[PDB]
Amino acid sequence: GLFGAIAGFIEGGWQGMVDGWYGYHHSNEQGSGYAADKESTQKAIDGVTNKVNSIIDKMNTQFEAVGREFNNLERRIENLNKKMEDGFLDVWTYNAELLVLMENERTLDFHDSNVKNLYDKVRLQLRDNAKELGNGCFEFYHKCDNECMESVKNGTYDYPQYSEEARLNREE
Amino acid sequence: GLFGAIAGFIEGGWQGMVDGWYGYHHSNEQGSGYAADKESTQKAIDGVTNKVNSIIDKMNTQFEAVGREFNNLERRIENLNKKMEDGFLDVWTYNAELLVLMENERTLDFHDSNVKNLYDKVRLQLRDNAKELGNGCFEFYHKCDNECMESVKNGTYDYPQYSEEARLNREEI
Amino acid sequence: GLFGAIAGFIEGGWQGMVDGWYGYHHSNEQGSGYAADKESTQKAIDGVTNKVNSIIDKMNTQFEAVGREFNNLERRIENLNKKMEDGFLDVWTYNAELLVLMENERTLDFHDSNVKNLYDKVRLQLRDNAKELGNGCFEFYHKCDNECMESVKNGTYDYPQYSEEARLNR
Amino acid sequence: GDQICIGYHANNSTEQVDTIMEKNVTVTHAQDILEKTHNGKLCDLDGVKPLILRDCSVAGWLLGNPMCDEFINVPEWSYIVEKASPANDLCYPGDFNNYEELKHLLSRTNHFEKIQIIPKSSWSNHDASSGVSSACPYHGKSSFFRNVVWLIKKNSAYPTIKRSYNNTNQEDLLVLWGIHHPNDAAEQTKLYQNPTTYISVGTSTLNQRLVPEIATRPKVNGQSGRMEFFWTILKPNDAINFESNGNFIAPEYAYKIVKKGDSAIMKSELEYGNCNTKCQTPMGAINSSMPFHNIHPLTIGECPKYVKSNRLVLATGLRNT
Amino acid sequence: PGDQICIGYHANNSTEQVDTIMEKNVTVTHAQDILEKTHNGKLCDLDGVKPLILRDCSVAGWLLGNPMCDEFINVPEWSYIVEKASPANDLCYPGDFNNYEELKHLLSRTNHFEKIQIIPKSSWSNHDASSGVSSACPYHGKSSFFRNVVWLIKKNSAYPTIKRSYNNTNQEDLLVLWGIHHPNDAAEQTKLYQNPTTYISVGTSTLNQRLVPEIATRPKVNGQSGRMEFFWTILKPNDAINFESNGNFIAPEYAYKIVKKGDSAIMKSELEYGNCNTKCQTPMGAINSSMPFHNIHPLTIGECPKYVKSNRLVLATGLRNT
Amino acid sequence: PGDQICIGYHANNSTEQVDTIMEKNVTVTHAQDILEKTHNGKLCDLDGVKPLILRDCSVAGWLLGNPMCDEFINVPEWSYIVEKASPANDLCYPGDFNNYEELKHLLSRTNHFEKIQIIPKSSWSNHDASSGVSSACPYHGKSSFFRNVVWLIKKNSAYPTIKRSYNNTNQEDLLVLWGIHHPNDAAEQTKLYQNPTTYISVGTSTLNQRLVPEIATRPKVNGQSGRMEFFWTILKPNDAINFESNGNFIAPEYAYKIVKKGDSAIMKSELEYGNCNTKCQTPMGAINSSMPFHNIHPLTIGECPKYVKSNRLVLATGLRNT
Ligand SMILES: *[C@@H]1O[C@H](CO)[C@@H](O)[C@H](O)[C@H]1NC(C)=O
Ligand SMILES: *[C@@H]1O[C@H](CO)[C@@H](O)[C@H](O)[C@H]1NC(C)=O
Ligand SMILES: *[C@@H]1O[C@H](CO)[C@@H](O)[C@H](O)[C@H]1NC(C)=O
């Protein structure tokens, strides 16, 4: 897609992550495990919800057809009436079909963009304390326990704390 | 945002930079300060001005209601008249409101994109000569004087001419 | 542009690539030359083609003006007929003009994004086995023959192959 | 050793959306926003029953076609249902003047109450009993419209009618009357004595004169004669004046407009479905949470918005794997 | 050794908010409101041309010359016409105005009506001109009539056949008005016009009518049991109008030169003259704005922003504020 | 040591420009025009079917049989109808056509009229069917009349009551036309018809009318102070039309079978036949285009592109050019 994350440098989605839309898989000494990122999932839910409500709201004040009748000496205005009603009908059909199409593409890219941003958030926290596999994964040059993993997900990872240990292990 | 920069990897804006929309903060041996990137700012002002104008211009031929009168024997046509005028009025109201909603989104992304492009512009201009701090800042592996600072702001930086002392410090740091 | 690639970090386009929209240029011992990325160009063709068709299809149900006549004691309905037909003409003229405008910008951004994604596909494949010049080019930390240069265009490039040569150079 | 990976959701779903640039894209979560389902029935609207005219037309009902007695007294309605071509319309052939304009008034009405404005027994100088036709039979007996009276000369004379009715009620009044068009000069004298007749009707805003139009005509329902019916709205405190020396079809009953509101005349072949709904179409009732539907453009009540498309699906999740 | 360059973006004290598809009330550094929401609540001149404000008179009242409408006996060029929802002074003597709405429309295509005499009132030698008045049309507590038409009555128990003509020898189209009196009974027909069987015939190059009076008792309106019915025609330069009648004829005296045609309007407003000047006028008040949109009233005249129904329309120009 | 691979995009010698919401006149590398701006300036057949060009005649002139419209005495199947803004050959004898605009609308739902005789001119043995001609309808310097209708005069100072009828036993709907003459005075009434008080009555199973002539004094139009008013009805298969009159009757002679109903149009244009074929026709000329949009004229017939008011509609396919 537009941002290269979904079906891009991350080749596929995870069947094993039922918790949310985006998240992490971590495997340290204390075992592996899937976990959702709550900050970005809630942001996406909120965005998508607002979009849906916005579309419905823009359509609540929309043309309503009324039945009018005419005699055989009123064909011109009957033809005009029909043409007027069918005209708004077509115009509102167009607006709805087009809005749905345009927003669907945007929703798809919105997700793509969130995934990349989540990945960059981790990448910019870790720097050279970890090796960038190139498929959405990071190999730690130091030992990172569950509480350390949580600081990565929390956005509070302490780079200076592990940098010296990472420097030496890397240099080997 | 869509591009991860504004309120993203750059946490907040600067109350101190009043010269434009996007720019730099430098810090070296001879003092620190704020300066705006005039180029990308002007590029953005022109884009936004034109966007505003084309929105206004596209509504230049919208429906204009004309008052008509009918007697008590012309209720069908009076009703046809009202529903058709309200019809176009609702349509154009939708067009106006929807265009502003959609473009407002695209504008915020535009600015986000521009901050991200300016960041990348410096990034590849410095290479390893400097260090990505991950917060929008680069720490130089060498001494960067005021004319070195205005070198990257002007967009004309010498990677090879500095790669000497940079590599030396980087290998030891 | 939105993705900072076309007329961004890649300053210009190549006249020498008549082969497609996006692709590569290689320099080695065997020689130099241009080549288009088949997969990248074909996806962008399908996308654009579909867009053009969606635009036309959605307009097939447009308003059709029909001429009507009135006598000179029917000036109110004549006026109403005129205003309504001009009204729909204007509405559909707006829809067409705006749709073209908006999707043009998306088409331009779409191409920008495809170049950006192609460049990243190469960067992630090569890792530190090459140097990033910052202009769209990669200088290899090992000798890469034409067979090795086709492996990066094809996607299946072997990193634990040239890990040795590139390691000791830095 | 230690690893962290960033990725996204996937699931078993097969739901599909479209974009400008790619059709049939599978996504993990999608939302349908389009109703395609109705119940095929004509229901009550917020507990208020519709008026279902069965085999009677609006004209048949309002004028009192002998075959439409089911509707001589009608309660408050939500909407009105008339067939495309009802059998029971103008039993005696002719026209309803401003008929379409009358139907439009009815669509802004919920409640008619019948009252007597001129008693049938008040015609001492005129025959009020022999104005019946084989064209308007009741059992197999010659009859006529119930709300209106066909006056015939009495004792070889037709004296000038001058009547006035004051609308003492609080409601607007729908008043109906008519003119008979005979087939030849000989019939004129036979029925009405006077050769050159007129009918003058007057309110404070209405001023009209009707003159018979004699012509030679083919039989419709066995009659070469014609009848043309006229109506007006009589405002509270206004009066209506009738003046005629022949061809007059006098009112007896008019309609109090007790409740005005939102209504409709629905064209539908269906009959009552003993149900309740919030939204009604001529094809059936809609019970839905969706914002859009594609059932029929002409609806009444709290309805989703009509659209012509066969599919409308919003993407909510991401591209599935 | 701690030399650094940082990349960032503007922030400020702005509180201005915009909406997007995905988020509401987003604070931004810069914004452009494009919607005008105010007016001065007054009916003004339109580019230095004063409107015609009919006050308590309707169009019919003005054109026929209801005696209560003497303010509008000779009106100067207008930019637009203002009429109330229910004008008090209409047909003082009750009745009908034939094709009234079509005349209203023609009037919205006009800017100036120059009144001219076409049949002088002193010209009726064999008919009583002066005693055709009614309590239904009072002036100063005294029986009067429409000023622009003449209600001719019999003279010395006689109503001779009238044959009058008028040639439009002017350079402009001419609006001409006349009428007919429908009496309440045969006795009133005798007392007013002597002849029991009467007619009015009117012919132009495009017009052909023969009116017969309709004698009938109708409910009292302003004391009157009879009715009057009015007709009008546009007579082109060099065309003539011929009247013939032996009773019930409401003859013209004054007609109207349509001297100027253009974009005019009949505005429905209860408001009165505001002694101001504007380029854009609504029925609720005048607009003075550079905004591309307004939400005051759909029915405007002049050089106006485009009408919309929103409460808010704010465009984002700057970025997301911190 | 210097082995290289570079990522790049296409550039060419294209000068094709597109617009966006933010940047106008962007030079693009591949574009697609979707707007047709061109036409052949001629009126053509629609899919091999020739239109009916009425030239200097009008619909009324054609159908009533104006002597100056003999080219349209028998018309073959048409695709559309072309009429001038001000056809010279309309109602040679002055008057009006009743419900003319409704008739034109019905005409626009028809492709084929076949003319048949319903009342032979020879069948009038007690009326003068030859002297009903006028200097208002000259042909080669001889007084004539409308070809399809008969102006009946008294014979031997007598106009007996007419009782004629016609049953439509054809399979098609029939358009039947007739008229009434309004004389200018009571003298002219007697000279033409003898009887002072006259009527025309017409009745089908749906139609009921009795017409009475309306005498008035009128200016001359084409040398005539008199007027004629024409009427029409559709006669259903197996329905009958009954006429009765004692004067002023303009009797049918020929009627029209509506043999083909379909999509048609009355096109307003000052052009004439161009001897061509097309799938899409405008009043300004024909379109031959694979394009989805055009800006030629809103009123088209046939398989046409969608109309927009734009000057340029160009869609970007390729990318930004260097
Ligand atoms: C989309 O898939 C559906 C499967 O039901 C198929 O019927 C349709 O043809 C497809 N549309 C396109 C454009 O491929
Ligand atoms: C947005 O904020 C405004 C304050 O001006 C408030 O009135 C409105 O309710 C808010 N809307 C939403 C959706 O929160
Ligand atoms: C775009 O440039 C072209 C030159 O052909 C011209 O048609 C157009 O007016 C220019 N428009 C703008 C906005 O510069």
Side-chain angles (χ1 to χ4, degrees), chain B residues 6-7 10 12-15 17 20-28 48 52 55-56 59-60 62 64-67 69 71 89-90 93 97 100-101 104-105 107-108 111 115 119 122 133 136-140 143-144 149 152, chain E residues 1-13 18-24 26 28-30 32 34 83 101 104-105 266 268 292-293 298-300 306-322:
Chain B
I6 286 178
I10 305 169
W14 296 329
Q15 220 91 173
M17 195 187 70
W21 277 330
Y22 336 106
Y24 313 92
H25 183 95
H26 83 273
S27 185
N28 62 16
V48 171
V52 174
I55 286 174
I56 293 167
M59 306 289 174
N60 157 67
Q62 104 173 12
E64 296 154 34
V66 176
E69 273 170 322
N71 59 65
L89 261 32
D90 292 338
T93 298
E97 281 177 13
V100 169
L101 255 38
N104 279 2
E105 187 147 284
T107 293
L108 274 23
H111 293 305
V115 172
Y119 175 88
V122 166
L133 293 178
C137 299
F138 297 89
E139 201 178 47
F140 287 101
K143 197 182 164 69
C144 189
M149 284 302 183
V152 271
Chain E
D3 285 6
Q4 63 160 27
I5 193 164
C6 300
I7 288 127
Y9 55 93
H10 183 87
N12 66 19
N13 300 145
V18 300
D19 308 330
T20 64
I21 294 287
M22 283 192 142
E23 205 182 341
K24 310 292 158 180
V26 183
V28 290
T29 54
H30 304 92
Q32 197 174 317
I34 56 168
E83 198 189 38
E101 288 74 35
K104 224 98 160 281
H105 178 266
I266 317 275
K268 304 238 88 172
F293 301 100
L299 298 167
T300 77
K306 302 275 166 267
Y307 174 76
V308 85
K309 259 155 70 172
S310 10
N311 314 294
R312 270 183 49 92
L313 266 196
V314 179
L315 221 35
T317 54
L319 51 87
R320 192 186 294 269
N321 205 12
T322 295

Side-chain angles (χ1 to χ4, degrees), chain F residues 181-193:
Chain F
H181 177 240
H182 309 287
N184 51 246
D185 53 51
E188 183 167 306
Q189 176 64 43
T190 328
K191 163 186 131 62
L192 262 34
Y193 319 109

Side-chain angles (χ1 to χ4, degrees), chain A residues 39-53:
Chain A
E39 194 180 289
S40 66
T41 299
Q42 190 55 41
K43 213 73 66 66
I45 288 165
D46 292 1
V48 170
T49 307
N50 293 338
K51 172 182 290 194
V52 170
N53 291 325

Side-chain angles (χ1 to χ4, degrees), chain A residues 14 17 21 25 97 136-138, chain D residues 4-6 8-9 103 309:
Chain A
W14 291 333
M17 191 182 66
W21 271 328
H25 187 251
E97 297 188 337
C137 297
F138 294 93
Chain D
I4 196 162
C5 295
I6 287 90
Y8 50 103
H9 184 93
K103 283 184 163 191
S309 48

